[PDB]
Amino acid sequence: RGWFDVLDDWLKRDRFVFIGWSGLLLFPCAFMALGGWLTGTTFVTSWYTHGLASSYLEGANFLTVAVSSPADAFGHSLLFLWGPEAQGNLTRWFQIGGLWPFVALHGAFGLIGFMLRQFEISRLVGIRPYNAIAFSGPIAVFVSVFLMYPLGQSSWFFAPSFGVAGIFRFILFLQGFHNWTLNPFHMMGVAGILGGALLCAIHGATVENTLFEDGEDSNTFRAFEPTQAEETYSMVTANRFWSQIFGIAFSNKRWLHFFMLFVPVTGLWMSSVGIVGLALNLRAYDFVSQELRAAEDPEFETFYTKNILLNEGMRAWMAPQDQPHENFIFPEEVLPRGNAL
Amino acid sequence: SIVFQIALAALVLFSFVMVVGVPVAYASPQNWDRSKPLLYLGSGIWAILVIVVALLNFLV
Amino acid sequence: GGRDLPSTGFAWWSGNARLINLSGKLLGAHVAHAGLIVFWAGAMTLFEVAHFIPEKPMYEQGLILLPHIATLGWGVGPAGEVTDIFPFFVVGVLHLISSAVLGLGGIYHALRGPEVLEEYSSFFGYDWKDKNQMTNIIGYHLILLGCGALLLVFKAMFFGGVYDTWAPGGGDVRVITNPTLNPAIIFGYLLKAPFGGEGWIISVNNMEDIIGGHIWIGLICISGGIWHILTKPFGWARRALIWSGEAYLSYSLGALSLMGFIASVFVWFNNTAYPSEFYGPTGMEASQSQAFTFLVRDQRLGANIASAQGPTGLGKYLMRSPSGEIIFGGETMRFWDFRGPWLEPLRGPNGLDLDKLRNDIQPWQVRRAAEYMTHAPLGSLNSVGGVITDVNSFNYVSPRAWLATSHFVLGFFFLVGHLWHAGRARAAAAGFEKGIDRETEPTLFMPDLD
Amino acid sequence: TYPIFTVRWLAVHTLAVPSVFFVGAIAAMQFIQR
Amino acid sequence: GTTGERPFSDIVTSIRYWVIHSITIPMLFIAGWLFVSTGLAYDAFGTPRPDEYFTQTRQELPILQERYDINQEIQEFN
Amino acid sequence: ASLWEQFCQWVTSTNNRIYVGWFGTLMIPTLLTATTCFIIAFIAAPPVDIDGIREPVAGSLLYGNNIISGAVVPSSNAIGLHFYPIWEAASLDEWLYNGGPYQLVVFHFLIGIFCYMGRQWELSYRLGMRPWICVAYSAPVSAATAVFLIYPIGQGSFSDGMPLGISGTFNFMINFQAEHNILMHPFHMLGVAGVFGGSLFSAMHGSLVTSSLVRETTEVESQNYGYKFGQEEETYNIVAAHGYFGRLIFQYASFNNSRSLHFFLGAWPVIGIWFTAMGVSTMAFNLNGFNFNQSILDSQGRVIGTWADVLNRANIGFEVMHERNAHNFPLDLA
Amino acid sequence: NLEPIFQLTFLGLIVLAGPAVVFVLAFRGGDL
Amino acid sequence: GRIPLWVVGVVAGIGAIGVLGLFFYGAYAGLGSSM
Amino acid sequence: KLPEAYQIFDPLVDVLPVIPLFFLALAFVWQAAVGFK
């Protein structure tokens, strides 16, 4: 019995927490990511990189804490602990945002480990690896948003910060600087996520309300055996209901469940493509026809032109505090603003 | 005026003892014979304590 | 009575459904809940009193129950200033003590008393399917409800009156002597459109109309109670309705949802039953108060507020409504139907009067407008008052906002409950609430749609 | 006769120990005056 | 259904578990409390104390500007 | 056998290709009216003075809008909450100028969707189904009611209702963020949990069923042909799905009961959308998201900014530029 | 203040009471 | 000699609501309270 | 503020309104004591 086979035996044991070969890269990496985030949100400041308090220790709450992105001055430096910036000094590494690349890179390798775990368990149990394929959506989003967007930008500084309000800032920043709501790729992503929610709610409700009377109690949950060969709900009744309500209905359950994977996953992929565009400032920012017309015709207004104005206001009022390293001095008189307000 | 606060403290403590005793008495069917008159006593004493507090508020 | 899933078919999370046909224990659950309601009334009122600063306005202290007492005309004088805290304290204590009596009765009936009242009494025993007795219960309660409405009437007419924000010489408690008995006005209120400028019953703007309404309500409710005790449901109603406990619950849930939405709108828009001196300005009032405040400032700086066109071409301070009424300019143009006791002195037959706006302003009106404008029902969830972009130093959320938001949410979730129980009552009456029978699935005997 | 120390025990402690440590630290912070 | 390990319900309802955890959980809690209240965490992570965000010589944000020599900038920022 | 009885039997007939029902007798005219007016307006409606300052906004395709920028513009702020049907205008052109199509379309739409919910219950009743699909549908109904009815009512104007268009929707959201900080409202956070989780669970359930399909086909054909419409037998092995998922996380984090699983799938997004609908409905009364501006102060009392402060700067930027000509006074009270 | 102490004491009493009633009813074989 | 699981659940729940309520108290006191 | 004769039980008054929440939680506590039968 060779040592490799013995190791593969121990790693693939049936225990409370399956480990597998993937676990050697999923567990330490996920634990570094999670512990780094908890550590940073509890103890670490963004004072020297952003001019912001970002931990519980400084008084922020769950909504306002973050592992903030590193200072712009480092560009895309990987900010290794032993790297030329921190030079092995743990305190300096904390103060320069070194926890952001730590959480991002351990999280990326942890996500790789989780997908490898999906594949490994699928193979052991003997099923198709569609759960692993479904998870490619989340990885596409993580890679495009947390790695490729800042990689195309000036530095890790403009990557989203790992925090509730940090994420909200990133969202509003993409609105005001990139007009990200106007981006068709985001629109396809919105359609995918909303359609995924819709499909979840409508399948759940349909199944629960077409259940076969398989028991005597009002508690219909007890009327299902995991090993039973029979369908627990009427697909014919469901099909007729939706055909007469909505005009169309699923008639193939396999296609229904594939569609439930396809929609949100495809939406995440499409939004990721759009974000990759935004990494290079390739934005669907404007409709040039309407800009040319409004330039020439001062009576012409649409909701699009109004949103353009909103974005200009956001940019001018947010830039000095959001990008403190640029030393944006915008005197009050140059700040765009409507009447009175 | 300290007699008023004594009466009010007695009301609050008897109220706690009754908050404890009422659900135990009504859900202890084997102790029911012993606990019916005690229930009557607690109710009457509670009402009397309320009336005494009421009046004293009107005397102080 | 079964208290487990094997004996009832209902899981622990649906446990109160096990009481549907246990009239004694159900009555106990009801009386103990009533006890919870009265307990909250008393305890929350005592909390508000202990937290009350008598000189500071009620809407600045997070109060929602003392405003209700003060509208009834207890503990307050002119302009709503607090005369004595004792009536609020008395109201709280009486609710708190009665709560114990109801708690006892509930725990008794829920735990110790008969589980089913059918055997014990013909009077208190009810079967859900017994339409005559269920209408009897409707009737007894309709007579008590009408008695409560007449209690409001008696307090307003013979027992010190109620707060009339529209009283001449300033708001004050007033005894109502001529309540509006004219059924045309009273029921006309029911027939008014629920849109801007009319407001259905939300637009009731005088205590005489409110009190005359409660005389009608008491009379109609007492008559309907007597009718329901002496009658039985007729054939059409016996045929169009579901006759079961869950069905009646769903009907009451629909009614409660309707009343919750109505209460939300009432507190948001009406300042007669909800006086602004207790509840703070309505949002319409705060907007109009802003327009008025800067009308007075700029006029005092020498501006012509009538002939001053704004940057758009509409009058900066004054304009015309789409029907021509002279109204305040700016975005407040939307709230031009707003009526308030501090504004109405400056309104002429055509709307806002230039002569009044140039000569009859009073310092109390300016002070009131400043106070109402700075207390606009705008605030954050953590109670940071004013617009959401403001900094953290103003601790205020309007009572109107709290009450309106709360009762809209409760109205919506009770509409959801109505749908849940109404659909379930229908399915259970029809016999397929537990799922589709495999042998007699209806769709298997229906022709294909195509 | 179950084992005491297993992979599950370590999976539980690796998370529970620092979590209670952090919860106590965040509790202490609730009393820091500026 | 059981992978071999003792069920959690059997563990947490047992005397020996709580004999151990009546001390271990509180000791961890107080260890974290002391980590904060002794000021150790400020020194460990370099988080400014409430009176060290701004100094006498600096009234503005200490935003990092060097590419490499950050020990020096953070020292001058104090 | 009477003619009314014959009509009742036809209306409630379960053999109609599209079920009508009593709720349908209202749904069909209202939704058809709304669709006709919406398409005609979106294509051809003249500009609308939304802000009531005589600054008409072009919403229709023929006036220069594309599909993304086109909208049916909400009715004028001068109207406020006043009822504005066609017969209250002195001409159709006055009706159009003041945004009457918006009122017509929204009122008929709202009635139509409430009737759609009732119709879902009605057909479930006629099919002998359980009755609660309409309860799940009440979540999007609540959200639509929030943006088209409740928010205007609370703000005091149908001009504050969501525009019937794509860029109009973004304008609504941006303005809403600027005046209510919806991102920092916990009910919106539950809505985001509802939609992210709804998509997560849709992907999870779809992927687990698809992974655990019973072999029925050859490799040359779509696996979907391994299911036959109306078949007795289950098309995937839930036991295999549970083994995989309970090893992916832990055994007790996985469902073995399809009924419990399908309940969770229905309940999670539905509850999340109920919360977000109520969030929009309560910010209609200006009970806004969390305000943490200048929450952190140092010892001297100087403000230490947080991410919430930067978000507030973004909100102020949005707020000072919105409806640039509509405000005459310093505070945006509605 | 001794007030934070009194409020927490009353709250602790009220919090323990209900569970204490259930505990007594379970320990003494009551009609739970 | 086994502590009933419902007692363990009640004790843990009380402690968890306690830590949550201490965290909410800190929102209004000390650092991060705006005062 | 409460009348002066009652200012003693003020800390008790501040913790009274919350009790119905404790009733809702006590429903669950009793169910857990009966094993959610």
Ligand code: CLA
């Ligand atoms: C308003 C809240 C409310 C009320 C009034 C009731 C009332 C009732 N429930 Mg319901 N229940 C509720 C909420 C409520 N429930 C919730 C939220 C849940 C979900 C957890 C349930 C789940 C549930 C189940 C699963 C079952 C019930 C049952 C019952 C009935 C029998 C009670 C019994 O034997 O318990 C016995 C409990 C005890 C003996 C424990 C002590 C209880 C007392 C009342 C505590 C009172 C303390 C109080 C402070 C004392 C004040 C005294 C003095 C000051 C007045 C009773 C009528 C049962 C039923 O249907 O019977 C057929 C049943 O099986 N309930």
Ligand code: CLA
């Ligand atoms: C109609 C109900 C209602 C309304 C409008 C108010 C309004 C108010 N209360 Mg009161 N209160 C109520 C009920 C109500 N309360 C009840 C039932 C209790 C007993 C616990 C209290 C106890 C109480 C105290 C002890 C205090 C207040 C205070 C206040 C004020 C500030 C509120 C605040 O900061 O909230 C913060 C907001 C929240 C915590 C948000 C709650 C979110 C809820 C839980 C969401 C649930 C929605 C939905 C139903 C969920 C269902 C899910 C399912 C159906 C799908 C405000 C005037 C304070 C004050 O100023 O006093 C003077 C104060 O100190 N209240």
Ligand code: CLA
């Ligand atoms: C909606 C409330 C309600 C209802 C319908 C009942 C109904 C019943 N109870 Mg219950 N009970 C209640 C509340 C209620 N009770 C409360 C709050 C308590 C606590 C004090 C009790 C305590 C209690 C006990 C201890 C007993 C009953 C019994 C009975 C039965 C016979 C009653 C009787 O003697 O005949 C009719 C009685 C009268 C006509 C006189 C009483 C009328 C009251 C006391 C006066 C008017 C009420 C109020 C003060 C005025 C308006 C209330 C206000 C809120 C508007 C009957 C099923 C008995 C039973 O189970 O018998 C088998 C029994 O032993 N009840």
Ligand code: CLA
């Ligand atoms: C809580 C109070 C209450 C309750 C539960 C009932 C319950 C009942 N009543 Mg009674 N009634 C009451 C108060 C009440 N009544 C009062 C106060 C009076 C005095 C005026 C009457 C007078 C009365 C008479 C004269 C009759 C009833 C009848 C009935 C039965 C069927 C009624 C029906 O189908 O309604 C549903 C209503 C309809 C089907 C009518 C259609 C109306 C259309 C749909 C328009 C509805 C308006 C719109 C949807 C809502 C707008 C909102 C806004 C107006 C609030 C039912 C048992 C009937 C019966 O069988 O007698 C024994 C009957 O003939 N009631």
Ligand code: CLA
């Ligand atoms: C007076 C109104 C009323 C009444 C008497 C009932 C009564 C009943 N309902 Mg209904 N229901 C109502 C309103 C009402 N409901 C509303 C408004 C809704 C919509 C949300 C529902 C939705 C509903 C469903 C979905 C179901 C019932 C069911 C039932 C039955 C069992 C209930 C039970 O044991 O609950 C047990 C109680 C609990 C499990 C506690 C619920 C805890 C919730 C989540 C907390 C809500 C938030 C609360 C305010 C706390 C917030 C504070 C937070 C910070 C902690 C019973 C007949 C069941 C049924 O059909 O049986 C036949 C059922 O499945 N009801």
Ligand SMILES: CCCCCCCCCCCCCCCCCC(=O)OC[C@H](CO[C@@H]1O[C@H](CO)[C@H](O)[C@H](O)[C@H]1O)OC(=O)CCCCCCCCCCCCCCCCC
């Ligand atoms: C069932 C579990 C058991 C529940 C019981 C305990 C749980 C948590 C309670 C601890 C809260 C601490 C109380 C405050 C200390 C007293 C100081 C004071 O007066 O206030 C301190 C401050 C300041 O307020 C003022 O302070 C002054 C100086 O001390 C005086 O004391 C004044 O009287 C006082 O008004 O006010 C607040 O911070 C009040 C808001 C926070 C208090 C309650 C927080 C919420 C409680 C739990 C809810 C969240 C948990 C979620 C769980 C999910 C399920 C529901």
Ligand SMILES: CC1=C(/C=C/C(C)=C/C=C/C(C)=C/C=C/C=C(C)/C=C/C=C(C)/C=C/C2=C(C)CCCC2(C)C)C(C)(C)CCC1
């Ligand atoms: C970073 C770093 C590192 C690492 C570390 C670690 C790994 C850490 C860990 C840490 C941890 C791992 C921690 C934890 C914590 C946690 C917490 C903090 C908790 C909390 C909790 C809470 C607060 C909750 C609450 C609640 C809810 C909400 C629900 C239910 C109820 C309760 C109450 C429970 C190293 C050294 C390598 C290097 C340097 C850097």
Ligand SMILES: CC1=C(/C=C/C(C)=C/C=C/C(C)=C/C=C/C=C(C)/C=C/C=C(C)/C=C/C2=C(C)CCCC2(C)C)C(C)(C)CCC1
């Ligand atoms: C007015 C007054 C009074 C009264 C009071 C009362 C009436 C009481 C009550 C009491 C109560 C009423 C209490 C209770 C409480 C409760 C609790 C405290 C609970 C808790 C909960 C929890 C903790 C949970 C948990 C759990 C479970 C059990 C289930 C499953 C899940 C879990 C595990 C999570 C007195 C006497 C003071 C005097 C003065 C005045």
Ligand SMILES: CC1=C(/C=C/C(C)=C/C=C/C(C)=C/C=C/C=C(C)/C=C/C=C(C)/C=C/C2=C(C)CCCC2(C)C)C(C)(C)CCC1
């Ligand atoms: C106090 C007051 C007043 C008065 C008021 C009044 C005079 C009342 C009345 C009220 C009324 C007079 C009520 C009524 C109601 C109604 C309703 C709520 C109805 C409903 C119905 C239903 C629910 C139906 C159902 C159905 C249908 C639809 C058909 C067939 C089937 C069935 C049967 C299911 C005034 C404003 C002057 C002022 C302020 C205060």
Ligand code: OEX
């Ligand atoms: O219309 Mn639409 O957006 Ca409701 O806040 Mn006031 O108004 Mn206007 O300004 Mn901001």
Ligand SMILES: [Ca+2]
């Ligand atoms: Ca106090």
Ligand SMILES: [Cl-]
């Ligand atoms: Cl805008």
Ligand SMILES: [Cl-]
């Ligand atoms: Cl304005």
Ligand SMILES: [Fe+2]
């Ligand atoms: Fe499924």
